[PDB]
Symmetry: D2
Subunit: 253 residues, 4 copies
């Protein structure tokens, strides 16, 4: 069927918790075997087990998405185990809040590396194998509303996410001919454990509700449909697009 | 389930053939009851007949999408029959090929009215009823690659489709608060009977293939996934967005 | 000289008052002979005299920009004398505030005709002559922040202005080969007559200042530079672009 | 006066040759004192000595735009003397052509550092001073057509230029309140030394001319107006915008 992922294997980076974990559970529910990833082995193992206990075919491979050596070692392990990555979601990346005039280069660099460079490095390894197998493939990059409009105090993130939007186009340009579709999801303001300080702040909550015409935050499960869509046959002729899931935020002045 | 349309009734304008017909068949396959509309009543009945014979729950209502009196009469009839339109796809619109300096006002106007005003009028009637029911709803407008970049000789269409892109944002702005999601699809170059002169031209075919990195035309069934996506629970937190289905055309310089 | 408009004749529609008047004054100050057009003949003559008193070479031609016969008659007069319109600014267009579910078709249509259709008709007449003279030309359409993001209660204006954005791309597509550059200005929230109600509402004022990082409304003379820029040799290789003048509004999430 | 830069000092990075040198000469001609920059000192000297003999107020400061210690040294120096940088053009950056599957991380990183990180670092030093002085400022980042649409084989450049487009929005977002306007120029295909290979290839020349409706390459001085525009009072209410100078390329499907 159109949205069925049975027979496919997905790898989601930074998926021990947060939205990454939600993508992974969501793809599993659509029938994919899923491989979770995080830098912390022990945490990753707990998240893998939680999905296994739900009846999903879940696995974990721990690696630093900024370390090209670790990345290729991970894909070589997967190779040896006969595991083909058909779907990749590049969800890894950090946040750093600081005005630009006060921003340390080291922090700028870490945001760019974990958010933008990581997507190149992981996609490079995954796409090579998709190409070699002639199996086709799906690559989903994670953008942000900041792929389109900036937020003060998160400049390197904003720059990285604008870069992710265009990197998505480059992957379409170079790989679509091999039946690989690379697209992006741009999540709006979503209730996560990480955002909990934002949701708890009455002023910030009011601002979110007045900025999106849906008048509410999104929940992580509301991103699942878009992940499955962009991972399935339903998106075979979609390439280089970013889909914002923001209840209407970017649409409104 | 996430992409199941069982229990939902969809109205697709200009769906006697071409892309509109494909949306109607796609929604029906996902479980929707479908109401086809065209201005050509005899053609419409034939198309409805075709779908019923494949085992789909299909019906036809013929009306001019530029005639608000005809639209309200059509919706009133549906009301009297206990039929609730939960999904609206505004696919109606004509094309007219002529350079602007040679373009007569009546033809400019016919393109704007059938493409842009039609989406306002049909949506107004549909949205009024979705709001009064507090049933929620889905509205999908049909843009084009010309919602983003222009082609010579099709200016009023281009203008109309740029207008559709922003009208979609307006519908997000005004109706998202009533749990109505209004989004748009921008089809790329798709093989349909109407485009047959384009496909049969060697030069034009080569240009299409060298302009999209997928190196091929799309088929109408490759738009169905997006239509179901935007008509289903999967798009509950998506609003005011246009999704291009073009094999990567817009992504590449 | 790069930003000098001496020797050029510009026509500006809807220029009896507001931003249209400011555009006319600005082009004159840069050296252009200016022809002001409006449907309101009385104060049109008043505005022309004001510019004349200031030392500028201003003239008035009153006609309805939605009446193709009046347009052709006005240009035919300009033809019978030796007046070449080298620069056209399509500033004409009305506003109408009303939620879509309460919006009468009559008013939707008047907004579309006066904003979008007017720009096609006036440019068609102007471009034809520019092409025949083969002396190049400049056409500047007037968009809005709503060419990119919507506001509730102004849907036909938003649709019209999104249409203007793409119509601008069409004019570049069809006329750039004749050395005509067609671009657009998207004004933000400016202190002008058409915004008096907005400016005097304490809440709207506060909303404008919190939404643009410049924390203030623009002034009409802050649009003049962009107009002169798009009318001058400086824009010779700029075509189909819209420049927003909004203090940073669209740039900020 | 609206476009006069007299009384302003501009710093243009990577301006020993090519478009950066053009920008420098352009600003000087509009009245600015100009400071050229490159890593190559004696080449830079030759370039400065060239402008001085044409009677421009030109100066040069040599430094690596990826080296934060060197950048501060240059400013801390200028700081130590009586030099205020009022206009900054971030033109520095390199190209690297290579398919992503064949691209070494070291080269990806060099492109990112030289194009995107450099703009952050130089702007940081400049903006801190503009803010402290409270005399306003202008910052112009250099994007590319790849800020919007990708080209195969130049992915890190495309990602960096996408990043530049959004970094520009961040600078508006954070610094517009200090009367600093940050905007970007996106040059299309321009007749320069750096494009010699491109230009003298018949196939490539043909593809450029068929892809932009002006049917020609741009000339270096056709970028000057935009740089002066964005450096002058004409742009006081423009912030976070990118202006593409491409003859209409991006406007046409
Ligand atoms: Cl005609
Ligand atoms: Cl006539
Ligand atoms: Cl009304
Ligand atoms: Cl390499």
């Amino acid at each position: 069927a159109l949205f069925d992922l049975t027979g496919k294997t997905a790898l989601v980076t930074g998926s021990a918790r947060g939205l990454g974990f939600a993508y992974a559970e969501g793809l599993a529910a659509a029938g994919a075997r899923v491989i979770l990833n995080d830098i912390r082995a022990t945490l990753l193992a707990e998240s893998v087990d939680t999905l296994t206990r739900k009846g999903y075919d879940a696995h974990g491979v721990a690696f630093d998405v900024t370390d090209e050596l670790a990345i290729e070692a991970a894909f070589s392990k997967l190779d040896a185990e006969g595991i083909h990555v058909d779907i990749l979601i590049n969800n890894a990346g950090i946040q750093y809040r600081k005005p630009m005039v006060e921003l340390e280069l080291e922090n700028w660099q870490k945001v760019i590396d974990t958010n933008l460079t990581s997507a190149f490095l992981v996609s490079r390894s995954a796409a090579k194998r998709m190409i070699a197998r002639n199996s086709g493939g799906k690559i989903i990059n994670i953008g942000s509303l900041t792929s389109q409009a900036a937020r003060p105090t998160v400049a390197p993130y904003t720059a990285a996410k604008g870069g992710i939007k265009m990197l998505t186009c480059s992957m379409a340009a170079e790989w679509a001919q091999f039946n690989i579709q690379t697209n992006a999801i741009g999540p709006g303001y979503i209730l996560t454990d990480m955002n909990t300080a934002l949701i708890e702040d009455k002023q910030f909550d009011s601002w979110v509700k007045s900025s999106t015409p849906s008048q509410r935050w999104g929940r992580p499960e509301e991103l699942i449909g878009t992940a499955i869509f962009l991972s399935s046959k339903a998106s075979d002729y979609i390439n280089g697009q970013i889909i914002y899931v923001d209840g209407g935020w970017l649409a409104v002045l």
